[PDB]
Amino acid sequence: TSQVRQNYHQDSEAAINRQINLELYASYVYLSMSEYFDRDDVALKNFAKYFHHQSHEEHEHAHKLMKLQEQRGGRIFLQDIQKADEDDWESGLNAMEAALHLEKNVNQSLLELHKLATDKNDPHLADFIETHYLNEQVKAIKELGDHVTNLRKMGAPESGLAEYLFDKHTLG
Amino acid sequence: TSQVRQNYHQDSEAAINRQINLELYASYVYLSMSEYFDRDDVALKNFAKYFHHQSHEEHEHAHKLMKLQEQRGGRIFLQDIQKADEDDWESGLNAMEAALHLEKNVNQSLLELHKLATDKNDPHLADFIETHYLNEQVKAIKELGDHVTNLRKMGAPESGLAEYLFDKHTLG
Amino acid sequence: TSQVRQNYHQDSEAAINRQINLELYASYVYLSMSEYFDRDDVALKNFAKYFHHQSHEEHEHAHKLMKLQEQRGGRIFLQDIQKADEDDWESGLNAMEAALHLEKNVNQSLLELHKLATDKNDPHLADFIETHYLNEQVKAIKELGDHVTNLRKMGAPESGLAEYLFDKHTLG
Amino acid sequence: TSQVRQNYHQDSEAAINRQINLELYASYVYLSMSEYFDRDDVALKNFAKYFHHQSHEEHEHAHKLMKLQEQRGGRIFLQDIQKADEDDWESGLNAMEAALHLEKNVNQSLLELHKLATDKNDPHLADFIETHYLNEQVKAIKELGDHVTNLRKMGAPESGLAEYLFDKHTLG
Amino acid sequence: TSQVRQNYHQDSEAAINRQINLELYASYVYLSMSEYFDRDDVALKNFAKYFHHQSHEEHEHAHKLMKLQEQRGGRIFLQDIQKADEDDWESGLNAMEAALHLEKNVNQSLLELHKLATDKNDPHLADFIETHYLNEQVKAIKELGDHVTNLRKMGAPESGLAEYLFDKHTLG
Amino acid sequence: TSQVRQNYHQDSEAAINRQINLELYASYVYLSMSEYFDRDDVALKNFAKYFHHQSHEEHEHAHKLMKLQEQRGGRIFLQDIQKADEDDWESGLNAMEAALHLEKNVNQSLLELHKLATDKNDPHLADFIETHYLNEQVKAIKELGDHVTNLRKMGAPESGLAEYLFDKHTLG
């Protein structure tokens, strides 16, 4: 056991490694979405820019969890990063809906991570989740909801003019 | 035979002169398209700007081929620049489609120029085509494809509002 | 007939299209001359620079005529751009002489364009020719005459030292 | 088949997708190495910095391949990113040796990608591999070799003072 | 065999060492020419400056080949640098002619180096020759041809006034 | 005999040409040493930088002697530049020792050049050797001695850590 390790439960260490893997998975999902919008038969550059930024941001989330693990004296165990469930994301609206779905699932996992920290009486880990993850999730989810709403009201996914203009005016 | 001439086959020299003529033809086609969008009954200024820029760029392509010819010790033989197959380009979408068609044909010609350089064991000419022409074609074609896609999805050519907004938001 | 068209005769419209073609032809002639001076067995860089500039300037002349056509409500009809009568321009002096010959012919055509505008009582077109073309021709022709004179007096075309020094001191 | 697709073989498209996956794998390997050096019982910050930079660079390599795929009209198919063969990299020298081993394998794959492009007569893809990947591999491998050499000569892995000073003076 | 060595044939390694020696020889030839023009009975300072620059440039060519050798895992074997075939270069024109002759021979050697790289299926070395050597040769040869032409037309080598003025106006 | 020649003995002229050749040889030796340290199995970049600088400096020494020759009315006769006696310089210490050995031999030659100038009553050449060569040799030799001493005391050539740190702290 690590010379720095203190008040850090084996279950928490494992939950962090699981969260590290999930952040990397969400990163890979966003990468997939980003490249779909760069296709010649889709060609929505700001949707592509939007998800590329989400991909990079998710890598920051994973790195910070890895930092936590290292600082607490835990050992990182990595797992394969699974490819997304889709290769083709259909439309701008459908990607926004899939992203919101994903973010809600990630939020649920982080809330279960917080409960575990409360149950193992680890207030450092609890505060870490609160400070760096919980409000970020809330903001992410709200933004995705905002986008889904506008796209729906504009006439997406049927209106091709709607996704074109949303790409231009909201995401550009 | 030129004092500088070395490893430069009569067939390559002639193929360059043919490519020089084709670059000038594409230039003239883009000129034609550009002026069509300046018509009072079309009046799409950014379509016009877009093809005017394509025309100038195609002149750069021709000049560089003429430079190659001169540097290798070949003699430039010019041919008439044929006028385009159309005087009236119908719509923004139709010009984009005709431009993509043209660029694919020019690409095919350049790939046949590369094969000839490989077959005559002329690695200088091969690299020249690779370096200055091949990726440029790929980029040109992809961009034209991107535009065709957006215009189609927006409701062009029937939607006059679609070409107006594409002119404004993509080409402006 | 165009919504903007007013006082613009079918004969004038056709004469403009013919002038547009001639400006493009002169452009192509100058291009040919420019490349000849870049040949390894000619290698007079400032002669080459001089005619390359003339080529670009002639494209400006054509564009402005196309602008006129569009503004007046006429329809541009392009024709093939014929290659020059020579592939080999012999010498610096001979190109200057051929350029002067060309410019005098273009001037004659523009003067016939002015007469037609006077005869069709089109004072806008008349002023356009006067303002943008007539004095430009006079200046072009005078400059070419000036160059022909100096080259002759220096000992061109026989004196190879004459063209070398004229290239250096006048055109450089 | 894509509107932009031209001279792009199904085998090449698939080879690119395989290369995309390998670049992402090398990225993940470097991530693993980077975090190992941040461990409290390793604590070599510049080794960690060095591999973190390698990880980011490998993501750039993957993105450019994805760009190529999109530009050529191919469809990206992603695969899981496998975790590295090690969780514990033993020492600074051993990570450098494993990195060199990895880079040589990636180089071999890229050379097989080039052969395939030559065999399918795809000079655009051939030039792309040459321009963006081949010399980069050579440089990467040479640098890793340079580091392995210095570490060995200094007395690594036994000399803990050797890795400490190499971390300070070469990687810092 | 080197830890970095990969896909690098013994024949290529030896051909590089031979090219390294030839670049150094051309460097030494240009050094010889440069000093000849500094003689009190020649005293053409810009000819001297011109070849001194060529000498330095040829050293850059050799260094880059040595870099390639080192990066690929090959071992440099140097050979004597032979003195030029002349101690006295007669005239400005004759040096330009001898330089052009030399550059064409060096070009031939580099083209044989490229063929060998193509035959040993070494696309890294092939691209290296293309990128850093082939177009440079073409440009060098064209420039030398340009100079030979002007000097001949001016009346060199008999006209001492011709070399004086070419020294002043072209090389100065 | 040269119009500028005065008080310049045939023996001195020949001794200068011999010194010119020796400076070029020392230049080539330093080039050889420099490239050895860039080898993947040596990888001492500041040793490499150090000898590369020595190589360039030795070329300056040769050029100045060539200047002297030209200014005095002598004729330069070049000789082959012999390759060094080694292809492999073993270690940092061994190169420093070989460089010191070389510099002492060059110094001896320059002192014999000075004696000859004193004996031929050529005070211009005597002062030239004194001013540009003699103190430079003394400084070069002292520096090489200084380096040899430090390397020995640090534990070179056996201590690989010694050459690594000397490369870093003295030569970097």
Ligand SMILES: [Ca+2]
């Ligand atoms: Ca986000």
Ligand SMILES: [Ca+2]
């Ligand atoms: Ca899976």
Ligand SMILES: [Ca+2]
């Ligand atoms: Ca709190």
Ligand SMILES: [Ca+2]
């Ligand atoms: Ca274009």
Ligand SMILES: [Ca+2]
């Ligand atoms: Ca026709």
Ligand SMILES: [Ca+2]
């Ligand atoms: Ca290439």
Ligand SMILES: [Ca+2]
């Ligand atoms: Ca003009």
Ligand SMILES: [Ca+2]
């Ligand atoms: Ca004709």
Ligand SMILES: [Ca+2]
């Ligand atoms: Ca790297």
Ligand SMILES: [Ca+2]
């Ligand atoms: Ca697995």
Ligand SMILES: [Ca+2]
């Ligand atoms: Ca050169």
Ligand SMILES: [Ca+2]
């Ligand atoms: Ca010899």
Ligand SMILES: [Ca+2]
């Ligand atoms: Ca020195």
Ligand SMILES: [Ca+2]
């Ligand atoms: Ca020998």
Ligand SMILES: [Cu+2]
């Ligand atoms: Cu996240």
Ligand SMILES: [Cu+2]
């Ligand atoms: Cu083009």
